[PDB]
């Protein structure tokens, strides 16, 4: 359906222990394709998807160039945020920045975004219209002004509506076998006897792509959300995902319960039943 490109930047100070940690990751949909890590050897932007490896020197030299410009801008930011907030040079603090663009099934621009965060909390963010900002508090107000006076949002809106999406569209072809795929969940159920008056019923979705999925239990057709244990959707490690939902059933009523799976890759919603 739709598709997205997103870059994630984690910048963490290490006072009396040197330069800041700076990590950059890049994703198209749920697939990472690149990484930068201040602490690694190459100081290059490295590929983490096999489709991107044959991009060329021009691409790699540029991404490295830019990823290092980010690194530096983030090295300054950490100090500037120490000041805004009147904080000690002793403290280790964290900055986070996420930006990316989305195309619809038309592979036509749909939306862009840019969020910045100091210490796990919203700082400033590009609003949906990509022409104005939302400073979260008093400190971010200074940035909001600074950035409006720099016409920062003009420059972002342009990247997001151009470079961003055109390259998102590029990658979707360069890795069409990976990215335009739809690995439907491999599903099955299990039954353990938590006691002799009870038994755990667990619904498994394995090896699916993308991550978006929905697992739900029912008793007599009626949802058990209140009484269901959902784990977070988790990485299998091979570019697919996993997830399970478990209910406890008083022995005898296994018949009453059903599990339900909704995914992109299923033509019809699966209705599992312990029957």
């Amino acid at each position: 359906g739709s598709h997205s490109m997103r870059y994630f930047f984690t910048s963490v100070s290490r006072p009396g222990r040197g330069e800041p940690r700076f990590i950059a990751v890049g994703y198209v949909d749920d697939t990472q394709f690149v990484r930068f890590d201040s602490d690694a050897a190459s100081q290059r932007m490295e590929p983490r998807a096999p489709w991107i490896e044959q991009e060329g020197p021009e691409y790699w030299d540029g991404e490295t160039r830019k990823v290092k410009a980010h690194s530096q801008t983030h090295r300054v930011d950490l100090g500037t945020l120490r000041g805004y907030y009147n904080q000690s040079e002793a403290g280790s603090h964290t900055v986070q920045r996420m930006y990316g663009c989305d195309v619809g099934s038309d592979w036509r621009f749909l939306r862009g975004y840019h969020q910045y965060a100091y210490d796990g909390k919203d700082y400033i963010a590009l609003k949906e219209d990509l022409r104005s900002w939302t400073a979260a508090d008093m400190a971010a107000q200074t940035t909001k002004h600074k950035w409006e006076a720099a016409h920062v949002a003009e420059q972002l809106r342009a990247y997001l509506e151009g470079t961003c999406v055109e390259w998102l569209r590029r990658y979707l072809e360069n890795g069409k076998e990976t990215l335009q795929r739809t690995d439907a969940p491999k599903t099955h159920m299990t039954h353990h006897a938590v006691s002799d008056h009870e038994a755990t019923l667990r619904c498994w979705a394995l090896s699916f792509y993308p991550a978006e999925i929905t697992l739900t239990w029912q008793r007599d057709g009626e949802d058990q959300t209140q009484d269901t244990e959902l784990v977070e959707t988790r990485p299998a490690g091979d570019g697919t995902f996993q997830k399970w939902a478990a209910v406890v059933v008083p022995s005898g009523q296994e018949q009453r319960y059903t599990c339900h799976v909704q995914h992109e890759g299923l033509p019809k919603p699966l209705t599992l039943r312990w029957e």
Partner: peptide, 8 residues
């Protein structure tokens, strides 16, 4: 493809 990059 990366994006300046303005500081806070």
């Amino acid at each position: 493809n990366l994006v300046m990059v303005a500081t806070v």
